[PDB]
Amino acid sequence: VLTQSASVSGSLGQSVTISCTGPNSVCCSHKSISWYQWPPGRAPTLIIYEDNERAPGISPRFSGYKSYWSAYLTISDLRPEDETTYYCCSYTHNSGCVFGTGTKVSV
Amino acid sequence: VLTQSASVSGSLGQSVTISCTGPNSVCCSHKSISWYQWPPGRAPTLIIYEDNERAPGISPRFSGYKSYWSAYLTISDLRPEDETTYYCCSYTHNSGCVFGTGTKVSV
Amino acid sequence: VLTQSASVSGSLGQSVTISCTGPNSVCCSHKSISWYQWPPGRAPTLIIYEDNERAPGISPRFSGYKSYWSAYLTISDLRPEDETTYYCCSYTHNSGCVFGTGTKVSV
Amino acid sequence: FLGAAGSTMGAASMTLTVQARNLLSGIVQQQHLLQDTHWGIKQLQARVLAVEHYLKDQKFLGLWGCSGKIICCTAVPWNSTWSNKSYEEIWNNMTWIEWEREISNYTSQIYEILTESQNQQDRNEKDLLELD
Amino acid sequence: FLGAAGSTMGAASMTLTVQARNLLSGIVQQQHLLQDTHWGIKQLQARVLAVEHYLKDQKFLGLWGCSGKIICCTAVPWNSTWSNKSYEEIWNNMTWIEWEREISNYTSQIYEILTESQNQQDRNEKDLLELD
Amino acid sequence: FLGAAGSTMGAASMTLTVQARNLLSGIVQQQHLLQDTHWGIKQLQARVLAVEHYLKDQKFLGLWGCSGKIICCTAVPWNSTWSNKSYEEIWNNMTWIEWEREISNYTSQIYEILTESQNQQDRNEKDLLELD
Numbered sequence: 169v170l171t172q173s174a175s176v177s178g179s180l181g182q183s184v185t186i187s188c189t190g191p192n193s194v195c196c197s198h199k200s201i202s203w204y205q206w207p208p209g210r211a212p213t214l215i216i217y218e219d220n221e222r223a224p225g226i227s228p229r230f231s232g233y234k235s236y237w238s239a240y241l242t243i244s245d246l247r248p249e250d251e252t253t254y255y256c257c258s259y260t261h262n263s264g265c266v267f268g269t270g271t272k273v274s275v
Numbered sequence: 276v277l278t279q280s281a282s283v284s285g286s287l288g289q290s291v292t293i294s295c296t297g298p299n300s301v302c303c304s305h306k307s308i309s310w311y312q313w314p315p316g317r318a319p320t321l322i323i324y325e326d327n328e329r330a331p332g333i334s335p336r337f338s339g340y341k342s343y344w345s346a347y348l349t350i351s352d353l354r355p356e357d358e359t360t361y362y363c364c365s366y367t368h369n370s371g372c373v374f375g376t377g378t379k380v381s382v
Numbered sequence: 383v384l385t386q387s388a389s390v391s392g393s394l395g396q397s398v399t400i401s402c403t404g405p406n407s408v409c410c411s412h413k414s415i416s417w418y419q420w421p422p423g424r425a426p427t428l429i430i431y432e433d434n435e436r437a438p439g440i441s442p443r444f445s446g447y448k449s450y451w452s453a454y455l456t457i458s459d460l461r462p463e464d465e466t467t468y469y470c471c472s473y474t475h476n477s478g479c480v481f482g483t484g485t486k487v488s489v
Numbered sequence: 490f491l492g493a494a495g496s497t498m499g500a501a502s503m504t505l506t507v508q509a510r511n512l513l514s515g516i517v518q519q520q521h522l523l524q525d526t527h528w529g530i531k532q533l534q535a536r537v538l539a540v541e542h543y544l545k546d547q548k549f550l551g552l553w554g555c556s557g558k559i560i561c562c563t564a565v566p567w568n569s570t571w572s573n574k575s576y577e578e579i580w581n582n583m584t585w586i587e588w589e590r591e592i593s594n595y596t597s598q599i600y601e602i603l604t605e606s607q608n609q610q611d612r613n614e615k616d617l618l619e620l621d
Numbered sequence: 622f623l624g625a626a627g628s629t630m631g632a633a634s635m636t637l638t639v640q641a642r643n644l645l646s647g648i649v650q651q652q653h654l655l656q657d658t659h660w661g662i663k664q665l666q667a668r669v670l671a672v673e674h675y676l677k678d679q680k681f682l683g684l685w686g687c688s689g690k691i692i693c694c695t696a697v698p699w700n701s702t703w704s705n706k707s708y709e710e711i712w713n714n715m716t717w718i719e720w721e722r723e724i725s726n727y728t729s730q731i732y733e734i735l736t737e738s739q740n741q742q743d744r745n746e747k748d749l750l751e752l753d
Numbered sequence: 754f755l756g757a758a759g760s761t762m763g764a765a766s767m768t769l770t771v772q773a774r775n776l777l778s779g780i781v782q783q784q785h786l787l788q789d790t791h792w793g794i795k796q797l798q799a800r801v802l803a804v805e806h807y808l809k810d811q812k813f814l815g816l817w818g819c820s821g822k823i824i825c826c827t828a829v830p831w832n833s834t835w836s837n838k839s840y841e842e843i844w845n846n847m848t849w850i851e852w853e854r855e856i857s858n859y860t861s862q863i864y865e866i867l868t869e870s871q872n873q874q875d876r877n878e879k880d881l882l883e884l885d
């Protein structure tokens with residue numbers, strides 16, 4: 169029910185942005201949005217847990233934001249290790265996690 | 276020389292007021308006015324010593340006030356034990372006490 | 383190079399003033415001016431070291447001031463012990479002392 | 490200790506200073522100690538007890554934000570259950586020992602509330618305040 | 622000491638008060654001393670060590686301008702070298718003993734900087750300020 | 754104690770901090786005690802005297818409203834009888850031991866006045882102020 173950009177591409181040292189939006193009951197107002205780097209066939213990684221807050225050890229070149237109808241994940245200073253699928257989730261303190269449709273960052 | 280209301284009457288749960296006034300040299304400006312409940316033929320009782328200040332243990336339904344020409348003693352929530360004679364006095368920190376003409380609260 | 387008033391006179395209980403002025407590089411802006419009582423043929427005495435500040439033990443009747451082109455030494459409540467020659471000097475924290483041409487206070 | 494406790498509390502409020510002076514130690518002219526074997530240990534115990542009681546009172550003071558003041562006003566409202574006596578009944582009719590005797594049974598809860606209230610106000614609220 | 626150290630630091634921030642109460646001395650009902658010869662000297666040493674540790678912590682507090690507060694905010698910025706952990710990582714994921722273990726190696730330099738900074742600001746700058 | 758007392762008072766005003774650090778106790782690396790019978794009592798006396806002098810100075814500080822500061826300004830005017838020396842004569846020509854030697858005979862009255870004045874101002878006047 170959470171939709172993202174189908175696919176997206178970038179180049180060296182750039183900044184690729186991915187969207188995450190849905191209905192009012194899924195992605196609107198102040199429901200926390202998390203972003204995971206999730207390479208296909210391996211283990212995920214917490215990139216950004218709270219809307220504007222990252223995970224420890226994450227390179228500072230990853231940023232997150234949330235509008236009133238869509239959340240955005242930005243990857244700056246693109247490096248070859250970023251070429252994976254990324255997924256978002258909507259959650260509150262007790263409500264369960266609702267993942268997204270994913271987005272493959274090309275280069 | 277200190278004059279009060281001759282006599283006064285009330286009923287259950289009411290509030291009867293008694294006056295205490297005299298010349299400028301007796302009851303005017305800021306000379307402290309005290310009010311004693313004084314049943315006839317028995318021992319008195321300090322009801323209100325300073326103009327707006329009561330004695331310890333007194334029921335809070337007794338109040339006092341002082342204008343620029345007369346002091347007033349109010350008895351609220353009248354009860355049968357209030358049916359006595361009340362007297363006022365004018366005094367300072369070193370000047371002697373000058374009692375009043377008394378007032379019998381009927382009911 | 384530092385010039386003063388040639389000579390000056392006063393009387394009992396008065397206040398005689400002496401000037402000390404020179405070029406911009408000698409007596410101008412904020413170069414400290416000191417005043418010494420220096421009887422001829424004997425030892426000097428520090429009267430005023432900083433422009434508005436005296437030496438310890440000096441009678442308070444001695445005062446100093448500095449304008450933007452001349453410094454002034456005032457002696458109030460004149461007494462016979464003041465009848466000496468007075469000299470001024472221009473100095474900074476590291477620059478050397480440059481004395482003046484002196485002034486004999488008559489009476 | 491020079492102050493007379495037979496005076497009203499409003500009178501000893503002025504004399505607080507000499508009593509607070511004598512509390513710390515005696516006025517100067519500290520004690521030469523020859524260190525008698527098996528003796529003087531009572532003297533060391535006496536000095537330790539002196540500093541212990543001083544520190545107890547300073548602990549109460551510092552927990553109350555009054556670590557530098559002799560008189561400090563607190564934001565603890567007075568419980569009428571502690572005493573229904575008025576201001577002119579306390580400060581003009583009672584003496585300090587009398588009032589402390591009357592308040593002794595509640596003094597413990599007073600200390601606990603006073604420590605909790607004065608600390609919360611000056612720490613949590615002031616912390617949240619400078620947070621913005 | 623009533624507080625449980627298994628809770629997060631944001632949880633023990635509320636319980637600070639009971640722990641600060643138990644630090645000074647035990648709750649009242651101090652100890653009758655018959656003064657056994659060659660005995661009880663360990664008890665005097667115990668009391669002296671108690672007041673010594675209390676005074677050490679109060680020395681650190683008073684040098685920091687916090688002599689009257691339990692929580693005080695300081696003008697010392699946090700060094701990322703001490704810990705790169707965030708606010709929600711410290712106050713929501715760590716417990717007080719864990720955090721003190723992580724910070725133990727830098728605690729000394731933290732104390733020294735905190736004493737120098739908080740003292741300079743509240744003495745030299747405030748002195749120069751009232752100078753004019 | 755690192756500070757050199759041969760420097761002027763204006764120079765040791767900067768070095769106050771290290772001297773205040775060494776006063777409390779030595780820098781860390783407290784003392785293992787095997788408790789020799791009839792021995793070590795001199796060591797307990799030494800520790801008690803250390804805490805006693807520290808507490809004497811902190812008593813003077815706390816009575817003066819300066820319980821949290823190293824430098825505090827007071828509302829006590831300077832008596833010219835104590836010393837007619839100027840500011841640049843004191844802070845630029847004298848050293849701390851010299852100045853304390855000069856002021857030693859008046860130090861007692863200075864302490865008493867300083868305790869009375871700083872206490873009255875911060876207690877009675879502030880009490881009457883919040884009264885309205």
Ligand SMILES: *[C@@H]1O[C@H](CO)[C@@H](O[C@@H]2O[C@H](CO)[C@@H](O)[C@H](O)[C@H]2NC(C)=O)[C@H](O)[C@H]1NC(C)=O
Nearest residue numbers: 331574578579581582583584586587588590591
């Ligand atoms: C002054 O205050 C004291 C309060 O202690 C009052 O005396 C108390 O009276 C009650 C009974 O009325 C006794 O139980 C207390 O032990 C008394 N306390 C004492 C004697 O310290 C006293 O009545 C007050 N004075 C006036 C004029 O009201």
Ligand SMILES: *[C@@H]1O[C@H](CO)[C@@H](O[C@@H]2O[C@H](CO)[C@@H](O)[C@H](O)[C@H]2NC(C)=O)[C@H](O)[C@H]1NC(C)=O
Nearest residue numbers: 224706710711713714715716718719720722723
């Ligand atoms: C909570 O904080 C602790 C910090 O202590 C994190 O655990 C540390 O992990 C590192 C290695 O990643 C170890 O070297 C430390 O010894 C650990 N400290 C402990 C266990 O106290 C822990 O990862 C944090 N939790 C989360 C979810 O990030």
Ligand SMILES: *[C@@H]1O[C@H](CO)[C@@H](O[C@@H]2O[C@H](CO)[C@@H](O)[C@H](O)[C@H]2NC(C)=O)[C@H](O)[C@H]1NC(C)=O
Nearest residue numbers: 438838842843845846847848850851852854855
């Ligand atoms: C610096 O200050 C000291 C004050 O102590 C001055 O020396 C004092 O001089 C008087 C006599 O003039 C002696 O009684 C004191 O014992 C001296 N105090 C000392 C030596 O510590 C000294 O004169 C001042 N310096 C200047 C240049 O004025």
Ligand SMILES: *[C@@H]1O[C@H](CO)[C@@H](O)[C@H](O)[C@H]1NC(C)=O
Nearest residue numbers: 568569570571595598599602
């Ligand atoms: C103070 O009075 C309130 C009023 O009911 C009461 O709840 C509280 O327990 C009292 N506290 C003390 C310490 O007396």
Ligand SMILES: *[C@@H]1O[C@H](CO)[C@@H](O)[C@H](O)[C@H]1NC(C)=O
Nearest residue numbers: 700701702703727730731734
């Ligand atoms: C804090 O970080 C700065 C930044 O370079 C460094 O110079 C300083 O030495 C550090 N101090 C401590 C106590 O870690």
Ligand SMILES: *[C@@H]1O[C@H](CO)[C@@H](O)[C@H](O)[C@H]1NC(C)=O
Nearest residue numbers: 832833834835859862863866
């Ligand atoms: C301070 O000087 C005044 C001025 O006469 C004097 O009355 C007072 O006793 C002096 N006090 C001290 C402590 O020197």
